[PDB]
Amino acid sequence: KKKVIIIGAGIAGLKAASTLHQNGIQDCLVLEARDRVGGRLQTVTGYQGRKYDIGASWHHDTLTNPLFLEEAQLSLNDGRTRFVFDDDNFIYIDEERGRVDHDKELLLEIVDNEMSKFAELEFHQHLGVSDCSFFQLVMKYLLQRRQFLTNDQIRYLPQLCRYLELWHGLDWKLLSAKDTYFGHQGRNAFALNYDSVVQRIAQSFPQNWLKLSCEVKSITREPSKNVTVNCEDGTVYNADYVIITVPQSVLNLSVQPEKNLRGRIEFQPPLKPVIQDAFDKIHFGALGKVIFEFEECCWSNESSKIVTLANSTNEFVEIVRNAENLDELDSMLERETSVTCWSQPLFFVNLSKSTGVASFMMLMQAPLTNHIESIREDKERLFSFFQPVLNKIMKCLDSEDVIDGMRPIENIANANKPVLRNIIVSNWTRDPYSRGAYSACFPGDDPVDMVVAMSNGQDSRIRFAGEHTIMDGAGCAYGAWESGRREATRISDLLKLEH
Amino acid sequence: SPAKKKVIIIGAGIAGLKAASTLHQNGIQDCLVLEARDRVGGRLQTVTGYQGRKYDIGASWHHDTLTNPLFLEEAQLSLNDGRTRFVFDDDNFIYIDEERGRVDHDKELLLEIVDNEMSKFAELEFHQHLGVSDCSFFQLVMKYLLQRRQFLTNDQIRYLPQLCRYLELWHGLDWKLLSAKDTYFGHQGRNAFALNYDSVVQRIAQSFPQNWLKLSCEVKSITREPSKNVTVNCEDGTVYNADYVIITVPQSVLNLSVQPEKNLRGRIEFQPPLKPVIQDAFDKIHFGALGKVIFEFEECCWSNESSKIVTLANSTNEFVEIVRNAENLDELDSMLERETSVTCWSQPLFFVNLSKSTGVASFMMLMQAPLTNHIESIREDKERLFSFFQPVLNKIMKCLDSEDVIDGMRANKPVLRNIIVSNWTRDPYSRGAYSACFPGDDPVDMVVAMSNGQDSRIRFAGEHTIMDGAGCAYGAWESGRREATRISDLLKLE
């Protein structure tokens, strides 16, 4: 009945669909478990109708990002604003000291930069002589260059350098040192509606292809030459080619016990060892977001990029200055509970400077993400948890402590203080169809394995797409976008030529 | 007749000095170090100015401190003796335009950010891609502005190209004379300003026999007697015989050997003449002209926010318009040809505010070719030099919170006392600053031909003879250790 069956309506699947149609292919489906398309691309609506991407937000690597370039071309022709370049000079804030960025005496940006070259040198042409954690790597550096670092640099640099946790959605003790640093192919463009991208692509093929709320439970590959696919409601579709775009975290269920897990797909035959071993190669991080909606901007718009540093100690400096080796240090750190807003770095996007909106989009990482998404409906607790970083920010930005206005209550002498009107939090680590943000690396991981395993397919019939099945743009919206065109063309020409 | 020697080293720069040090280290004797100037150090020279203030008029920094074998050694000493030999002086750059004043870390221009994107663009352009032609740095920037114009503001298109040019002060070349392929190179970590590089020179010089050193002897020729012997002739008539010789004269001096006329100061006559691999290599690598000008002030009466300051060369909104309307690089080159004298604003200038990094109320300024040649040529006319750098000097004071500079070369106003100027381009045993690439140059040819010697006995060392640390003091050093080690080993097999 069906030529190709695309599982998942994220951008990978939506692209694969747009293409198949672009190549005259007919009778193809798109089975999406959620009741909406977009997958990890979702724009929501808050106070006074403001819109925010709770999922993906940027076009990364604008110098090579092909999806972005398509968008740029569209904007050249119709003048419609689709994105904005929000790269800015980062403001770094420490609870006690305050702003530690562009410091005439701390010069953290320079050492961080060195820190970066050091890491490159440690793994350059070595085959990864034992991979450690970003945390360990940072320690090695501090030890090896202390003779050339002041006290304040040994104390703060490691905290500032953790902003990289918000790029992987992983804390520095869980993240791989070998993958921490990666290529940044040019500036980033804040998408002004990734939902426009999702919207455009979904409307580039027969709407009657989309089947929302279709949980796919099992995929069968009868050597006969067809592929049996059964959604959850008991329906069944027969197809020649199948493009599975579910997320790595989800797919990683097909290789475990308990087939009653939400989303899990039963494969018949079972995924060859290559694929199943790929999963031991690690994956899935947990980048999260909290949107803070204020009545109006009443703070300085010096920068659109603000990062709060996790608390540090002079007791740390002393331990670096006295350790005699990695072992004595790796141990002398036996020094030392209660997670607070100052227990990890937090990345704040000041939307006022960049998009004229009085809100802040904050990014968070594991293990914090899952705990905060857990209390997403408890506005009061969320406000109490972040109130201190928020006020520290407002202070540093020539403003005042935040007033809680989420409950409809109007006052007048508060037109000079920032009034918080609402909080929106993501829910990716708890949504069964995502179970996390995107692929990431634990010390010892190796992405190539999975990319190859995935791009080589289960066979000539069962293929794969998604931010986890490609090398360029891995984990990014465009990476997923291209992986969708890939499998799509590999099946397309393989049909036009047929007959 | 000619005194016998095991090894003869030509040149007492850091290369020859280290090569000799290594030799005396591996127990070799009857060696000689022939140097044309009345001093050792070569391109490393510390001079004296107002009040006894000292400055390096040649090399100043230890580059790539994460892997600099020379630096590491220096830092090891300071770990014991506890004395200060250097100071990490990297800092956030302050960029100054004539009209607009400071343009660094500006929330609207974000120049440093687009600058970062441009180098990435350059990396994506040549890295991994074979066959791509070379072109000039200037051409590379124009191409970038062309391809990314839809994503840049008018002021970025205007100021970025001028901000990118600080790289001219890393090569000693104007962006039109500089090879795009060689413009960007890795920096293995922070830089360390040596507080007197002469202390490095001295320490190495004193690590071997004094009698080994012969200053003021200008070597004029080297000959290979096809039978384990090399003849060297100082101009003072003396003649020496050696088993080995390590030639360390600058690439620019050595270049004089492949041309007819033996009466040029520094030129060495080779018999047999240098092999064609060596000769032909001079066509694929050239020489840069980085220069220095020291501005000594009475006292420091200016802001010490940073020790790094770069004055941008003038730009015009007309340029932005041309970039906006150009159809391609072809039309842009055409429109750009929109045609008077050279001023302190005709090219970027790089100033080191020594006040902040050393406490000394002076400015160390770097310049590039062609400006360096014109400035060093009139380096004796102190009045003309002040009139030249006055507008720019003032502007700095303004941006740094102070008044115009006062000429005091004979309360809250900065008073200029002395102006020192480098002389590397006019010096016969220098003839320029250091190895550099014009578009098309393949530096590997020279490095290969050099480290493989003229033959088993005629060897070469110097900053232009090695890959890692090429053009650097520590590379010259390593090349010195290289040649000496090889020889020791050979002289060890008796």
Ligand SMILES: Cc1cc2nc3c(=O)[nH]c(=O)nc-3n(C[C@H](O)[C@H](O)[C@H](O)COP(=O)(O)OP(=O)(O)OC[C@H]3O[C@@H](n4cnc5c(N)ncnc54)[C@H](O)[C@@H]3O)c2cc1C
């Ligand atoms: C907080 C956060 C921020 C991010 N920010 C950025 C950014 O700034 N820039 C960037 O480039 N990328 C960003 N990303 C990553 C980007 O969102 C993803 O790479 C991309 O959306 C993945 O697309 P996909 O099509 O592969 O998968 P989705 O993850 O799009 O998966 C496709 C669909 O599969 C469906 N599905 C799953 N299981 C089943 C099943 N059993 N049956 C049927 N359907 C099923 C899902 O419900 C989903 O809709 C971010 C991600 C997160 C979580």
Ligand SMILES: Cc1cc2nc3c(=O)[nH]c(=O)nc-3n(C[C@H](O)[C@H](O)[C@H](O)COP(=O)(O)OP(=O)(O)OC[C@H]3O[C@@H](n4cnc5c(N)ncnc54)[C@H](O)[C@@H]3O)c2cc1C
């Ligand atoms: C203005 C300027 C700034 C610089 N700044 C830096 C910096 O910040 N950091 C850095 O790492 N590098 C810097 N350099 C480069 C550094 O100075 C050189 O890499 C290094 O000093 C070259 O050493 P060398 O031993 O090869 O040659 P020298 O240049 O050491 O040459 C060797 C010797 O040969 C002698 N000689 C020449 N001809 C004859 C002859 N016929 N007979 C006898 N002797 C002869 C010369 O007098 C000279 O002393 C700078 C150079 C210049 C010009």
